[PDB]
Design a protein around this ligand. Structure first.
Ligand SMILES: CC(C)c1ccc(CN2CCC(O)CC2)cc1
Length: 171
């Protein structure tokens, strides 16, 4: 059976209990924590690509008011469909399963200024999603897992000083 488990789920959950925030910049910023997963139940002999995208969680944006995240207006039109291709792609099942798959190099941006970046809307909540694409497959079989522990609000600057302190503490 295919299983894709979140790595460092305890670390993610400590950010999630505060409401997680990820910085977006013109030139793009790496995530902390980094999304890493463990995989079992691929065909070790088959080749696959790993893709990462970010699904908009809500029909509204968010605002940080009096130390609280609250609904903060109607959402901006959906960010243009960005997919990050994991740099080990394509590769054998055995490769993806032997060690944690890390998306450490993906950069989150609020400006389409080129280079494997993901465009997000400030003050919107996203849920990371990983796709496993079977290579050479005439049925183009894809599998998709979502990681609710990894949900965050995209920000141009940290709102919650407690998130700022956690990012410093563990990073
Ligand atoms: C005690 C537990 C909560 C914990 C704390 C710190 C780590 C290490 N981790 C931090 C940042 C990641 O992007 C890579 C390494 C993992 C787990």
């Amino acid at each position: 059976e295919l299983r894709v488990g979140l790595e460092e789920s305890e670390l993610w959950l400590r950010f999630k209990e505060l409401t997680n925030e990820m910085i977006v910049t013109k030139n793009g910023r790496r995530m902390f924590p980094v999304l890493k997963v463990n995989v079992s139940g691929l065909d070790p002999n088959a080749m696959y690509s790993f893709l990462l995208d970010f699904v908009a969680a809500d029909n509204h944006r968010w605002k940080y008011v009096n130390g609280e995240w609250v609904p903060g207006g109607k959402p901006e039109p959906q960010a243009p469909s960005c997919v990050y291709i994991h740099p080990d792609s394509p590769n054998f099942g055995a490769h993806w399963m032997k060690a944690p798959v890390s998306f450490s190099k993906v950069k989150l941006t609020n400006k389409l200024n080129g280079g494997g970046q993901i465009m997000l809307n400030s003050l919107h909540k996203y849920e990371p999603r990983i796709h496993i694409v079977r290579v050479g497959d005439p049925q183009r079989m894809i599998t998709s897992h979502c990681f609710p522990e990894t949900q965050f609000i995209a920000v141009t600057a940290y709102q919650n000083e407690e998130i700022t302190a956690l990012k410093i503490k563990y990073n």
